[PDB]
Amino acid sequence: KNTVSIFALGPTITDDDEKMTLALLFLSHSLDNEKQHAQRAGFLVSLLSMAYANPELYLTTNGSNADVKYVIYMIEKDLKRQKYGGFVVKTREMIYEKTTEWIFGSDEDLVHTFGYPSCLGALIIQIWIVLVKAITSISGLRKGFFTRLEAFRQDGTVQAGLVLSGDTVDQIGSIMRSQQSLVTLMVETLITMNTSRNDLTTIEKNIQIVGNYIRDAGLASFFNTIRYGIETRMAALTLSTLRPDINRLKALMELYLSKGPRAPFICILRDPIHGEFAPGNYPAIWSYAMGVAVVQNRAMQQYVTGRSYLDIDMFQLGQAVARDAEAQ
């Protein structure tokens, strides 16, 4: 497997002031265009694993990917050395002189007021927010990123100083789309976070909050077809016309249950079965649900208009059947 270099701070680095500086350097390396996407992704994994106390375990546990083998290189501070603030990339037995130059030689006030862990969390939460729309809805990433960020900024989770450039968010999305490796670790982390314990850091609570938005992304029309077509349990379900599409919806629901905890992230992971959930496959039921939905929900003709597949008869029946229901 193509190896990715992950850089982890050693026990020698203790200063909170210093630790933020390394995190900012890790971001810059991820945004360096001279590096290839995979190397840049490894710098992003380095930043994300910074939250976790034992990066090696975090990666071992959640980073078991078929694509990339992660190599962890410890960054330590050597007080003898004068270059690059005494920082060095050292393996247990060796000092990597050239890699030290690569990381360091190659071309603060907030930290005292709010603290290192608060300040890193700003950087790490922004990286996760990119994933909500990066794979599923590339076009709306910047709008979506800021939408989710709004809440965090007001909470003060993300300070105004630490907010990420639009150019930065676009790069992070491209790296995520390019490297499935990144996405698998993030998804697996979320699944390993399913087990509920009081042992969740401020950041891990924040990760799970973003995770709810990331969990069922791209399958929305499937869920809207279920909510406003099947859960309504109106009498039109008996119709012979809807019977084939109802059977398919059954199959897709059963398939989704099959995929397991992985299932919410089908479209995010770009699984082979991810286009089987598209409303074109089951068009009559989708049209009916969209009719019930426009009668039941304020607007939402927004969310579905000028679809090649819309069955006008089913759409109108759905509206009628819902209108009778609204009376009661």
Partner: peptide
Amino acid sequence: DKSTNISSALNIIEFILSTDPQE
């Protein structure tokens, strides 16, 4: 979790199919 959402629906569909044989 949409598991309850899917579970509720699968049960509803099975009822619909079982009660109404081939429409």
